[PDB]
Amino acid sequence: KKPNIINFDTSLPTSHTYLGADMEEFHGRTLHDDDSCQVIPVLPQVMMILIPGQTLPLQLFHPQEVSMVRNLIQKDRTFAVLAYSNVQEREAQFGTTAEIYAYREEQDFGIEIVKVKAIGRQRFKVLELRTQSDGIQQAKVQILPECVLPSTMSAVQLESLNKCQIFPSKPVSREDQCSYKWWQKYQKRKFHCANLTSWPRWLYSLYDAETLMDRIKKQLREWDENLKDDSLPSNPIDFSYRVAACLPIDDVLRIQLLKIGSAIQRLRCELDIMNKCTSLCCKQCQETEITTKNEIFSLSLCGPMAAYVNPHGYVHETLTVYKACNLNLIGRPSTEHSWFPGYAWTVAQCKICASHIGWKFTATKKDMSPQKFWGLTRSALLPT
Amino acid sequence: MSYNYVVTAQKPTAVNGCVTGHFTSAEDLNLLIAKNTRLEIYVVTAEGLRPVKEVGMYGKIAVMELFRPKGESKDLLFILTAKYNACILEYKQSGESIDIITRAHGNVQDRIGRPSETGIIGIIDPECRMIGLRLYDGLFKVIPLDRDNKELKAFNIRLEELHVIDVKFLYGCQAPTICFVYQDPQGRHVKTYEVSLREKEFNKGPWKQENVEAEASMVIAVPEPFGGAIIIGQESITYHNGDKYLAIAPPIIKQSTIVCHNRVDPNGSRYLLGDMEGRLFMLLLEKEEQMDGTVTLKDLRVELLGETSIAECLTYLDNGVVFVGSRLGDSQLVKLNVDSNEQGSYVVAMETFTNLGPIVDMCVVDLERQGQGQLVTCSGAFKEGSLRIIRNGIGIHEHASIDLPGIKGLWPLRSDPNRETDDTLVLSFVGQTRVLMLNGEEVEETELMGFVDDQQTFFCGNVAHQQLIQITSASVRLVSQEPKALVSEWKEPQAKNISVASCNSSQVVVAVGRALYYLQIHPQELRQISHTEMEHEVACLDITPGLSPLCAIGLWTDISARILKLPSFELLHKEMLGGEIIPRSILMTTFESSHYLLCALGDGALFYFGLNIETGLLSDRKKVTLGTQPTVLRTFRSLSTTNVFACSDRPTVIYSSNHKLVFSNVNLKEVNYMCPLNSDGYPDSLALANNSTLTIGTIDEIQKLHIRTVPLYESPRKICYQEVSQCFGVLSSRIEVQDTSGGTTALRPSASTQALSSSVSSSKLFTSFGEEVEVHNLLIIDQHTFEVLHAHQFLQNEYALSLVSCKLGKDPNTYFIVGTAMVYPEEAEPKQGRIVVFQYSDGKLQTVAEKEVKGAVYSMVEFNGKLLASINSTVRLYEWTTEKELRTECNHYNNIMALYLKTKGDFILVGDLMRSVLLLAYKPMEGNFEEIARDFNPNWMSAVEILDDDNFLGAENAFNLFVCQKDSAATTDEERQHLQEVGLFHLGEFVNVFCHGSLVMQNLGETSTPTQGSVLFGTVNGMIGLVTSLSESWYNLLLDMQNRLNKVIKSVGKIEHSFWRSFHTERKTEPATGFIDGDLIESFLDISRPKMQEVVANLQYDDGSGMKREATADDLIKVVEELTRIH
Ligand SMILES: N#Cc1ccc(N2CCN(Cc3ccc(COc4cccc5c4CN([C@H]4CCC(=O)NC4=O)C5=O)cc3)CC2)c(F)c1
């Protein structure tokens, strides 16, 4: 429980200086026409459900994938990441397209190892998984559309009380008696036309966009001390994607939130999960508590969970906890490729099964969080 | 594979905009009202509003204004549709053909754009140079107003302020100038722009940005010579003209915010305001400042006029008459009399225009006539909440009406030689007896020679031997008809006062006190026949033919019908039926081609009975609730055969087909006393004398729907009907302010605070001064008098959601099951609720049972003697144990909140607000639910209903209707588990509730009707619909005839029907499929004969062998009349 002093300058982890510094950057964005079928290459050796807006680092070594990256960059820069189900071996029906923005090629070790960073952009469905003899299979991809709905009172609204539907900004910021009182009048004035329908105002508040985001922000701030507008988007779509990325949930739930096509439904699902979720247990054991619900913080602007690459290319999603339980450390704290600029990782293992639950990030300087940082991964971590 | 047919049984009533101006002609003053898709044009006169036109447009009116460009004699009307169909219309009449021609028309939507949160704004330049539309965020769309712009081509000008609240054109500018209030992170600001048509871009405003109140809502443009604008907030009203500035903060307006306004003076000296809770304010501008001819403002005094209905649109008609247009109440027409001030109110109501919306819940019950439905809705909200009863009735058309000071009785009289034409009518006041002779349309009254001016007349008809008996309390006098002079006058044998006297063609029976006399009719002589005495007081008498074989008598106390020989006192029969009160009136007739005698008591109830033609008495016992007032039964020959009129608080017409006397509720508020009439002006008509006035007219077809109100002065949420108790259980809620004493005081006398017996829930299963808290009640209401018999008040902070009236298990009793939820402002999603089982008996509500559930009970249904409840996202089945305690049987956990539950057999249709329709089946052999089919599509659903075992009907966003069908014959599981969608329609209304039933007589008819089933839906605007099924052949024929009608019928605004009915949504639009527009098919009867022939040329009408390519024209008339008869 370390409050107040959280001095890390929590933006470096979302820059990945471990993965090379002089990283070549790419100008901007792209767009795929909605409800269209395209041909997208699939980069292999990746097994993770990449939520849109989530950064994915990558190290690629094999010649086929390097050449695939090469001809991708010279023709568009988008590939496909498939949301693999519980069954492996190409048992995927949905996925997301990752766009490159950061590139470097290294000739070291007599190899053409490529260090590349991407972020997901769109959401899609695979019709059939076509396989190409080169090794890089291309799928024919159908762009699953994004649904944004109007206000639930827009249909039943009165044409007079319409100029009374632009609220003054939230008073001050993140202050009591400035929220519980502001939100009451906000609900009272926004859903005044709920009297014409057959439902109470609070029911329509359960399907509101601002209200659901506010509840998620409140609970998240209860977990970690967020900086109000600490890169949390105002758009419900982007906020839903960020929260879905940062929730410590199992794979089936991520696939389920990936299936949802509307922001409001996604937010209701996320509240259901994070209100019904208390403990996170070791998947290989399903018997030992390494964590809890209140003990989750963020050194990254992307939240308590982020995607990182070890020097062997494997991708890990890491969760930060103050004081982990039932973990044993082995090895001296070393800092060759620590993903956090200033700490020294020590591998931790389950007290019974001895699985790579994560790392303990001990400090190096003295004006840091002192040896209290467990970056546990998801390979053995099931919500319970 | 749906093939449905949707029709409107009652047009929308809620007003969402009204204007006035010289529209029909430059001399007339017209009031134009848009209710939704309907535009009604009235003419303002001294007596009130005279309707001129009703035109139905192919869209929802979002904006209308009246403008007059140069070179025009009368105003044109610019109407914009909710689908962005702009049009400019012009009134044109030639004697009798009334036409609204379309001057211009065009869609003005944009290919890309999010519609504004504050909605569509439509404004017109006061000099009539341009039309400004704010449809989309950050874009002001401008339509130049030129004679050559007949397609309404428009251009977009960029607005840098994305959040624009209100914008209007200023008055008195050389070039068009707009002024608007917008939102910024720094606060709210007012700004002005100079729109330039040639440059097609804005310019610099005459007066720059000024900071305004943080809650500035409306801008009103003050006309010359003041100029400038007035911005009204929640606490202050400010006037801006650049250098000139005023601001006031009156405390009278702090209670509620102003939402509507309307200028009342052509020079803008006074303005009229209305607020959210419905009170009229009166802004006053003083022009006392005048330096060198310039007129400048000096004060902003605000005055409160009074309290009216909750208004959405105000309008000032001529001579201090204000039309208060309500949308969630009733429209009003009030007077701004400044001298009345009876207790401090400047307003008095003149008229009240009915408004059924918003219909929150509705039910079909057989209140009066078995087989024919009656609709009971839950209309209005806040203080206008009411119960409204909709009924089919035989409306009466009035020919000639002359007001009367509440006549107490009328009788036709003839003062001419016998020619089957009665040109006179003897009235009957309390003690006075006037006679008015009306050969044509005359209303002057002259006293008859044979009767005194004031004698308290009882019977005055046509006496025998060409005479006229004008009876009175003192004596029975008959005056010769042709000589117009008295020939005989027999005094009462007992020398007393005669109360009830009955006269027939040949025999007369007059009763005084407890003794009666029978007198024969003789030429110029009143020859007494006999006399008799009664055991008790003679309440009523009747001798129906001319010597009757029996007489009628009722007792004041015993209240038993006695029948005896006409020429003596020899009794023949008697019978006592209840006898709760004195029998108001008893009469016998042969309307059913058989001898029947009916009695009507003082409570309005009626007891039919049978009688023999020669001699003998039958029982034929039946109880009828005609009304809550005494019923003066009468017979009028100008009918099918005889019929019967039962005048009461709710008048009725009795008519028998073969042996079942059916009731036709006449479409009138009150009739009091009635009579036939055979005058030359109105032959074979009826003269009715209502409490306030009187009329003479005829009857019409059933093409009428009557709405009777029951105000509750609070919002009614849900309604159910209990037959065994003859009662209505209605949920309701009232707003109570939190006073500084720990309690909650009310705001006005509501139906919950004015009940006979009251209760407060007492269960133990588990702020700021000024906050409004909602208090929920279950009211038990009588079905006849509509008086609140009971009012149960629930716990604090408990919201009652649902209500069902049903019997469970083997228990003979019927109960009210109410599902509640404990909601607290701190928490968003309730954690605990309560299922409470009440039982109404002996005029007292007793809590039979309590169950505590963990969640909100959003809905409940009666699933084959087992209560089916939806606690949050879990559907649960309860069994009524023999110990009167609910027990859990089976659960089913969903990922959606089961807001909607509809059952048909063993098929639970489950919904949520996200249009995630799900189907469940309850397998009984194992006792658990199973999922059959699923249809998930992100969209807002308002309602859902099970049409039949395969098709499910629902309403969703952008006022649409849809029909989903499961293919149970599919050989693939993925299609079996999927609900294919087979019907789309743009209804144009927001439907809250679906219910099975029909408002017309349920006749099997052997051959039945092509329409199978009937589902009624209620909308926010107050429009009742009706959807039925059709066969494939009829669907194809009606579709072809619809497509051929679309090329003949010319719509106003030239909106294509295909576009108007196409399934619309903010993201995607599709054509309507599987739905037949009943309004269009029904409008086919109103077209002319050449258009009649143009529509039908190759329809291939016959389907029962052959095609008969001619198809005629009267075959489609027969088909369309058959479709007309279903509602
Ligand atoms: N074909 C082919 C091919 C060609 C070339 C290859 N090269 C081999 C040599 N590699 C250099 C090297 C190796 C070894 C280290 C030690 O670091 C390791 C080792 C193993 C796992 C992890 C770490 C660190 N670490 C976490 C701990 C938590 C934290 O904070 N951060 C982390 O990174 C791990 O999980 C450092 C540098 C470069 C690549 C190749 F591997 C394949």
Ligand SMILES: [Zn+2]
């Ligand atoms: Zn373990």
